[PDB]
Structures are given as C-alpha cells and as structure tokens.
C-alpha cells in the first residue's frame, strides 16, 4: 500500500478523504490503516 497522507486529524498531511485522495492521485482506491488507523494507505 502507498502512504501519502495521515488519516488521523492533527498529523502532517492530513487527509480524511483517503479513498478519494488515492483515486485523485492515481490509485484504484485507498483505506486508512497502520497503527490506530492513523495512516492512509492507497491500494497499489
């Protein structure tokens, strides 16, 4: 998975629309994961 933004509010590069963000960038989709779902991971 490609990381390109923080799912948790406060962290640098915050992006709530993880799914849309990934789609907009150039990935099929995206989903928040990692520790406490703080990182947004784009489905490669």
Curated annotation (Swiss-Prot):
Its main location: secreted. Changing residue 19 to R: Improves antifungal activity. It is found in: Secreted. Changing residue 36 to L: Improves antifungal activity. Keywords: Antimicrobial, Defensin, Disulfide bond, Fungicide, Immunity, Innate immunity, Secreted. Disulfide bonds join 7-32, 18-40, 22-42. One of its GO terms (biological process) is killing of cells of another organism. One of its GO terms (cellular component) is extracellular region. It comes from the Eukaryota. Possesses potent anti-fungal activity. Belongs to the invertebrate defensin family. Type 2 subfamily. This is Defensin ARD1.
